[PDB]
Amino acid sequence: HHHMLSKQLFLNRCKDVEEYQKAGHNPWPHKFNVSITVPEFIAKYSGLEKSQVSDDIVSVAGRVLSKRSSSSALMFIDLHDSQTKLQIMLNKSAYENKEDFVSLTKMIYRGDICGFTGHPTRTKTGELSLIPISGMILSPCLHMLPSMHYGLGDQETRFRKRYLDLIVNPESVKNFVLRTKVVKAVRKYLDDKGFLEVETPILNTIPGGATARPFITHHNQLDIQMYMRIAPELYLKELVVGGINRVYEIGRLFRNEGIDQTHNPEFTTCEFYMAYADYNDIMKMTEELLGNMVKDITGGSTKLEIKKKMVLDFTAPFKRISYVHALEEKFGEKIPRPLDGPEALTFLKKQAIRFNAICAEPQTTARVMDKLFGDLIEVDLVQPTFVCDQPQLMSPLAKYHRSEPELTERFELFILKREIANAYTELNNPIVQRSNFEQQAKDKALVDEVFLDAIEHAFPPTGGWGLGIDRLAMLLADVDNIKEVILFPTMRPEDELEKKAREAKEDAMVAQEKA
Amino acid sequence: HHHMLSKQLFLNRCKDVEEYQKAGHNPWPHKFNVSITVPEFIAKYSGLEKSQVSDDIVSVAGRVLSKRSSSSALMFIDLHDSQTKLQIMLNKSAYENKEDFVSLTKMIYRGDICGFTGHPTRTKTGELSLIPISGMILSPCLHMLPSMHYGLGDQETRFRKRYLDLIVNPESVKNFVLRTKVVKAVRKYLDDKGFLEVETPILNTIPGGATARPFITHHNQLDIQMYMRIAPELYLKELVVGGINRVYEIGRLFRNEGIDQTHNPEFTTCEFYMAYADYNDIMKMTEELLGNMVKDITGGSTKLEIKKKMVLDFTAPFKRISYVHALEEKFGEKIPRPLDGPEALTFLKKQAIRFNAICAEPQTTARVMDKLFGDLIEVDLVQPTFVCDQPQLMSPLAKYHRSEPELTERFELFILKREIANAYTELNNPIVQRSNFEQQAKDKALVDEVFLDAIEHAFPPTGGWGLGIDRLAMLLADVDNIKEVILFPTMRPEDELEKKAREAKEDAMVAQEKA
Ligand SMILES: Nc1ncnc2c1ncn2[C@@H]1O[C@H](COP(=O)(O)OP(=O)(O)NP(=O)(O)O)[C@@H](O)[C@H]1O
Ligand SMILES: Nc1ncnc2c1ncn2[C@@H]1O[C@H](COP(=O)(O)OP(=O)(O)NP(=O)(O)O)[C@@H](O)[C@H]1O
C-alpha cells in the first residue's frame, strides 16, 4: 500500500481546507497588503530593546515553518520571507477578534502562507517579533514539507523539486542571486562602453560547421528542417559588417550531447564583438570586468575558496603564458620548426612517453600536443591566467599571429584548471575564411554562404570574446556541480521504479514520526 | 550568362587585393588604433571655423561610402562610422609618405574599411573634415555595395541580407537601438523593485497544455522527445512557491505556426510574477513603466505617430473599461445572467446580427462574445486602455473576481487596436487548478504534475504580468511589420528561381551603369 500515509494526509488536508471554507473563511484571499518585508522589518525595528513594544502598525506575510505554543492563549510562529525569519507572537489578549483567534490558531498548518498585522516588539527572551491584532491564511499547504534541512546531497530529489529545495535549503538561493549579479556586471560593463545588446536567431536552416551535435526540429508551414544554435558568432559578426561596431549577446545555446556535472543540454554564454580591437585589448577588458565582479562580492580583488581554505587572486594583471613556450619551458628545450611537420611529431612523441605516460590515437600532432599540454601544464593553472598564441595546428578558424610564425592571435583564460573565457583577433580575410569553411565541411563529412557574402563585403578588424556564464557562476559560488547554478537543470524522467521507491521512503519518514 | 558582371567584378577585385599585397601592403592589418569615434569627433571639433585647422592629431576609422577627387593631389572621402559621416580630405602635400599616398588613393574602393590619422579641420566650404598624415586599408570590399538608399520597400532583399540593409539604410539602426532601450527600461524598472532576473528551461519533456503548436526536437542520450517552450509561466510560479517573491524573465518563446507581419516563429516576451500583489497593482506598474519609456523617447509622456501625424497619450492614468459593461454600453442594455446560459446566447446572437453583420461557427457563447467584442469595441481602442474583468467564459485559467460574479481578475492592455500586455491576479487554488488542467488536457485531445505538486505545497497570492517585446518595439518605432524590429527574421529559403532572378537584376543594375 505504497505511499498510503501521504495520500491520507493530502486527503484530510483538503478536508480541513473545505471545512475551513464552509465555516466562512476564504483559504485563498485575493489581496493582502504587505506594508513591510521582514528584512526591512529587521532593519527598521532591530533597535528595539527587550519587552519594548512599538506603537507602529505594520503588516507582514510569509511561510510558516514553525508553529509551537506554550499555551492556548500564546502561540509562536516562525514566519519566513526572503530567506529571513520573523517570529509571530500570537497573544490572545492582544488579538482584536477573539473568535477568529481560536479558529485561525487551530487551522494554521506548517507550510501555510500567512499574513499578520500588528506591533513590532522584542520579547524578554530577545527575539524580535510581531504581535498581531489580526491575521489570516493566505494560502494553505496541502502536503508535509520536509524537515530543515533535507536532501544533502541526494542531488536527485533536490533538482527534481527545485521549489522544495529552495524552501528547505534557503542557502541555495544565495547562488542564484550571485548568478544574476554576474550577468548585470557584464551587461553594465559592456553597455557603458557603447555595446548594443542584441538578439539573434536560435533557430537556423543551416546546421553549422562545428562538429558539435545539434538539436533538430521542424517548421511546419515552411516544411523545412531547422537547427538550434551552437553559437551566435556569425550573426553578430554580420552585425559588425553592417555598421554596428560593438555588439553583444547573452544567450542560450544548445548541445545535443551528454549530461554531466559540467554539462547541461542548454547553457548560457556571453559573446561580444568589438571593431578595431585586438585580443590584448580584450585581455585587459577581461581583467577589468572579472575584477569588478570579485570586488563586488568581497570589497577586495582576492577571493577565498575551498581547498578548508585557499585564495584566488583576481588582482590585475593576470599572469599570461605562451602555449608552445610553456610546453618548451617544461620539456627542456624547443620543438622542431614546422610544428605540423614529421620531425616535430616524432619529437613530441618522445616527450609523450618521457613525461605524460599517457596519450591517445589517432596520433595527429594536434592531439598529442593537446594531451601533452593537457596533463603537463593545463593541470595545474589554478590562479587566473591567460594562455596565448596557440598554434595554427590547434586553431583552424583563427587569424595568424602578426610577428611570430605558426602561431595565432587568441587566448584562453584558465582558472582552477578550467577554461572560463576566450578571445580572438578575429579572422577577417574572406578568401581564407571561405577555404576554412569548405575544409571544415569536408572534414565533417551545406556551408553558410550568407555569412561568407557578408564578410566578402569587408569585415572590419574586430576583437571577439566569449564567456561561460554557468561555469563562471560555478566558480564564484564555489560549487563543483553545474546544476547548483541552474534553476531547473535537465532531468532524466524518473520511471516507476525510483518513483515508487521515492514515495515509499517519503512515507517511511512519516512512519518514523508516528511510531 | 546570368550574373556575369558581378562574378567579373568579384574576380578582378580579388586580383586587385592580391596585387596590392604583392606590392608589400597588408589588406588586413591586425590592429589600427582609433583614438576617436566620428560622433565624438563631431562633438569635439564642430566649433572649428572655416579653413581653420586644429593642432591635434587624431585617428578615425570607418567605411568609405564616397570617393571622388577634383585632382590627383586632392581626394575627398565620405567615411562612415556609427551611422555618422566624416569627410577625409586627402591632400598630397599634407600626407607624409608621398609614395604610399599614390598607391593608397588609387587602391581605395567604395565599401572599403579604412583608417586615417591627421588633423581635424573645417574646409572653406563648411565641411568638417580630417586631413590625413597617414592612412591605410583596414579591410577591402570585394563586391559592389548597392546605392544609397536601396530596397524600399522590397522587404525580401532587405531582410535576407540584413548586413547590407544596415549599411544602405542606416536609419534602420534607429529601430534596434530603440528596442534595446526598451528591455533595459523594463529590467531597470523591475530590478529596482527587488525582482530577481532568472533563466528557466527552453526545452521541456512535457508539451504544455496550451493549444499552440510547439517545435519538437529530440535528446539523444536520454532518448526522449522534447518541446520548445510556449511560456516560462510554470517555472517562474514554481520559483514563487519556492520562496523567491519577485521574479522575471525576458525570454525567447517558440510557436510552430504561420509567418505574417505580426508573427515570427521565435519571439521575445517579458513575464514577471510578484507575490502579494494583484492586477490593480500591476496596472499602476504598467502605467509607470510605459510612461518612463515614452518620456525617455521624448521628454514628455505624449508620443507622436503616423495617421501624417497623430498622438498616443501615455499619460497616467490610462483609461480602463469593464468587458461586459462596455459590451452592454454599446448594445443598449444588459446581457442576461448566467452569461454561459442559453438565454444569454440567444440574446447575444440578436446583437450579432443587429450590429456586427459578422460572426462564425461553432457558435459558442465565448466565440460570439469574442467576435462581438472583436469588431464592435476592440476596434477601435487607439489610446492606451485597460480592458478588465473578462468573464469566466473567456478566462479558463484565471481567478474569480472578488466582488462581482461571473467575472475574473485580469486585464489586457490595448494600444492602437492591438494587445500589448496583460496581467492577472493569479489562480492559486491547487484543486481548481488541477481540475482546469485535466479539463484542458481533455479539450486538447500528459499533464504537468510537477507544477501541480508545487502549488499544492501552497502558492502565495501573486500578480502575473506579460509583455510582448517585439510588438512594443513595433509600436514605439512606428512600424507595421515585426521584421522591422527583429534583426534576422525567419526567411523561407529562396530556391533557384528567385535566386537567379535576383542576381540577374543585380547585374542588370551594373549594365544600367556601364552603358
Ligand atoms: N553543455 C554545456 N554546459 C555548460 N557549458 C557548456 C556546455 N558546452 C559548452 N559549454 C561552455 O561553452 C564553451 C565550450 O567550449 P568547448 O571547446 O566546446 O568545450 P568542450 O569541447 O565541450 N569540452 P569541456 O571543456 O569539457 O566543456 C566553454 O566556455 C563552456 O563553459
Ligand atoms: N509569433 C509571434 N510573434 C510575435 N509575438 C507573438 C507571437 N505569438 C505570440 N506573440 C505575443 O505573445 C502574445 C500572444 O498571445 P495570443 O493570445 O496567443 O495571441 P494570438 O493567439 O497568437 N493572436 P494575435 O493577437 O494575432 O498574436 C501577445 O502578447 C503577442 O504579442
Cβ of A163 within 8 Å of Cβ of B200? The answer is no
**What is the distance between the alpha carbons of residues B423 and B281, in angstroms, rounded to a whole number?**
10
Mutate to test the pocket of ligand 1, among A267, A390, A416, A484 (most ligand atoms within 8 A of CB): A267
Q: Which three cell numbers stand for residue B47?
A: 566649433
Radius of gyration, alpha carbons of chain A: 30
Cell 444588459 found at:
B334
Nearest residue of B to residue A179, measured between CA atoms? B198
Handedness of CA B214, A493, B464, A30 (dihedral sign): positive
Q: Cis before residue B218, ω within 30 degrees of 0?
A: no
Q: Are A370 and A394 in contact (CB under 8 A)?
A: yes
* Backbone angles phi and psi of A66, in degrees to 5: -140, 130
Q: Are B187 and A188 in contact (CB under 8 A)?
A: no
Relative to the alpha carbon of A260, which ligand is closest? 1
**What is the distance between the alpha carbons of residues A413 and A284, in angstroms, rounded to a whole number?**
12
B269 touches ligand 2 (CB under 6 Å)? yes
Relative to the alpha carbon of B485, which ligand is closest? 2
Cβ of B203 within 8 Å of Cβ of A276? The answer is no
Q: Are A421 and A465 in contact (CB under 8 A)?
A: yes
Superfamily of domain A150-515: Bira Bifunctional Protein; Domain 2 (3.30.930.10)
Nearest residue of B to residue A168, measured between CA atoms? B242
Q: Which of B5, B3, B86, B94 is nearest to B38 (CA)?
A: B86
Q: Cis before residue A362, ω within 30 degrees of 0?
A: yes
Q: Are A8 and A511 in contact (CB under 8 A)?
A: no
Show residues of chain B in contact with A487, CB under 8 Å.
198-200, 235, 239
CA of B468 to the centre of ligand 2 (A): 8
A410-415 sheet: strands from edge to edge: A196-197, A246-254, A266-275, A462-468, A418-425, A410-415, A385-388, A319-322
**What is the distance between the alpha carbons of residues A418 and B375, in angstroms, rounded to a whole number?**
61
Q: Where in chain B is the domain with CATH 3.30.930.10?
A: 150-515
Count of positions (residues) in chain B: 515
CA of A459 to the centre of ligand 1 (A): 27
What's B45-103 look like in SS3? HCCCCCCEECCCCEEEEEEEEEEEECCCCEEEEEEEECCEEEEEEEEHHHCCCHHHHHH
Mutate to test the pocket of ligand 2, among B263, B467, B476 (most ligand atoms within 8 A of CB): B263
β strands within B176-296, DSSP E:
196-197, 203-204, 216-219, 224-228, 246-254, 266-275
In A242-396, which residue ranges form alpha helices assigned H by DSSP?
279-298, 323-331, 342-351, 365-376
Torsion angle (degrees, nearest 10) of CA B157, B159, B161, B164: 90
Q: Which three cell numbers stand for residue A84?
A: 529571513
CA of B172 to the centre of ligand 2 (A): 24
Count of positions (residues) in chain A: 515
What number does the ligand 2 atom closest to the CA of B265 have? 1
Cβ of A254 within 8 Å of Cβ of B203? The answer is yes
CA of B417 to the centre of ligand 2 (A): 14
**If you take atom 13 of ligand 2, which residue's CA is the nearest one?**
B468
CA atoms within 13 A on the CB side of A412: 15
B105 touches ligand 2 (CB under 6 Å)? no
Produce one character per residue of B327-362: b if its CB has 16 or more CB atoms within 10 Å, e if not: beeebeeebeeebeeeebbebbeebbeeeeeebeee
Question: Is A38 in the B-facing interface, judged by CB distances under 8 Å?
Answer: no
B471 touches ligand 2 (CB under 6 Å)? yes
**What is the distance between the alpha carbons of residues A462 and A464, in angstroms, rounded to a whole number?**
7
Pairing of strands A52-53, A58-69: unpaired
**If you take atom 4 of ligand 2, which residue's CA is the nearest one?**
B263
Q: What's at A141, amino acid-wise? A: C
Cβ of B266 within 8 Å of Cβ of A224? The answer is no
In chain B the first and final C-alpha atoms are separated, in Å, by 18
Question: Which 8-state DSSP code applies to residue B397?
Answer: T
**What is the distance between the alpha carbons of residues A14 and A8, in angstroms, rounded to a whole number?**
10
Q: Is B431 exposed, middle or buried (0-12, 13-18, 19+ CB in 10 A)?
A: middle
Q: Any bridge partners for residue A224, and if so which?
A: A219
Mapped onto helix, strand or coil, the DSSP state of residue B451 is helix
**What is the distance between the alpha carbons of residues A330 and A374, in angstroms, rounded to a whole number?**
13
Binding positions of B for ATP = 255, 263-264, 267, 471
Cβ of A458 within 8 Å of Cβ of B63? The answer is yes
**What is the distance between the alpha carbons of residues B422 and B281, in angstroms, rounded to a whole number?**
13
Show residues of chain B in contact with A454, CB under 8 Å.
161, 163
Question: Is A265 in the B-facing interface, judged by CB distances under 8 Å?
Answer: yes
**What is the distance between the alpha carbons of residues A432 and A452, in angstroms, rounded to a whole number?**
10
Produce one character per residue of A320-348: b if its CB has 16 or more CB atoms within 10 Å, e if not: ebbbbebbeeebeeebeeebeeeebbebb
| Structure determination technique employed | X-ray
A468 touches ligand 1 (CB under 6 Å)? yes
Question: Is B164 in the A-facing interface, judged by CB distances under 8 Å?
Answer: yes
**What is the distance between the alpha carbons of residues B402 and B421, in angstroms, rounded to a whole number?**
22
DSSP per position, B343-391: HHHHHHHHHIIIIIS---SS--HHHHHHHHHHHHTSTT--S-EEEE--B
Element spanning B423, H or E: strand B418-425
* Backbone angles phi and psi of B119, in degrees to 5: -100, 130
Q: Where in chain A is the domain with CATH 2.40.50.140?
A: 1-149
**What is the distance between the alpha carbons of residues B216 and B218, in angstroms, rounded to a whole number?**
7
CA of B308 to the centre of ligand 2 (A): 28
Q: Which residues fall within 8 angstroms of residue B295, CB to CB, at 6 or more apart?
A: B301
**What is the distance between the alpha carbons of residues B290 and A379, in angstroms, rounded to a whole number?**
52
Nearest residue of A to residue B65, measured between CA atoms? A243
Q: Which three cell numbers stand for residue A238?
A: 554580420
Q: What's at A78, amino acid-wise? A: D
Mapped onto helix, strand or coil, the DSSP state of residue A158 is helix
Q: Please give the C-alpha separations between residue A443 and each of A214, A396, A408, A437, B270, in angstroms, as whole numbers.
A: 17, 12, 21, 10, 42
**What is the distance between the alpha carbons of residues A391 and A410, in angstroms, rounded to a whole number?**
10
State the architecture of B1-149 in CATH terms. Beta Barrel (2.40)
DSSP per position, A173-229: HHHHHHHHHHHHHHHHHHHTTT-EE----SEESS--SSSSPPPEEEETTTTEEEEE-
* Backbone angles phi and psi of B138, in degrees to 5: -95, -30
Q: Which residues fall within 8 angstroms of residue B59, CB to CB, at 6 or more apart?
A: B32, B33, B34, B35, B36, B115, B116, B117
Show residues of chain A in contact with B165, CB under 8 Å.
242
Q: Which of A434, A487, A459, A11 is nearest to A273 (CA)?
A: A459
CA of B269 to the centre of ligand 1 (A): 28
Element spanning A38, H or E: helix A38-45
Q: Which three cell numbers stand for residue B20?
A: 596590392
Q: Are A504 and A6 in contact (CB under 8 A)?
A: no
Closest CA of chain A from B150, distance in Å? 14
Q: Mutating which of B112, B457, B462 best tests the A interface, going by the most A Cβ atoms within 10 A?
A: B457
Q: Which three cell numbers stand for residue A387?
A: 594562455
Cβ of B256 within 8 Å of Cβ of A220? The answer is yes
What's A379-425 look like in SS3? CCCCCCEEEECCECCCCCCCCECCCCCCEECEEEEEECCEEEEEEEE
A263 annotated as a binding-site residue:
yes
B267 touches ligand 2 (CB under 6 Å)? yes
**What is the distance between the alpha carbons of residues A174 and A178, in angstroms, rounded to a whole number?**
6
Torsion angle (degrees, nearest 10) of CA B357, B363, B365, B367: -70
Pairing of strands B196-197, B246-254: parallel
CA of B482 to the centre of ligand 2 (A): 12
Q: For chain B, how long is the longest CA-to-CA vector?
A: 94
Q: Are A510 and A9 in contact (CB under 8 A)?
A: yes
Q: What's at A109, amino acid-wise? A: Y
**What is the distance between the alpha carbons of residues A250 and B251, in angstroms, rounded to a whole number?**
11
Show residues of chain A in contact with B112, CB under 8 Å.
458
Closest CA of chain A from B424, distance in Å? 11
Cβ of B167 within 8 Å of Cβ of A14? The answer is no
> Cα B467 to the chain's mean position, in Å?
13
Q: Which of A418, A152, A428 is nearest to A278 (CA)?
A: A428
Closest CA of chain A from B235, distance in Å? 8
Closest CA of chain A from B142, distance in Å? 6
Q: Please give the C-alpha separations between residue A489 and each of A153, B23, B206, B237, B482, in angstroms, as whole numbers.
A: 16, 57, 14, 16, 33
Q: Any bridge partners for residue A468, and if so which?
A: A269
Q: Are B500 and B299 in contact (CB under 8 A)?
A: no
Resolution of the experimental model in angstroms, please? 2.9
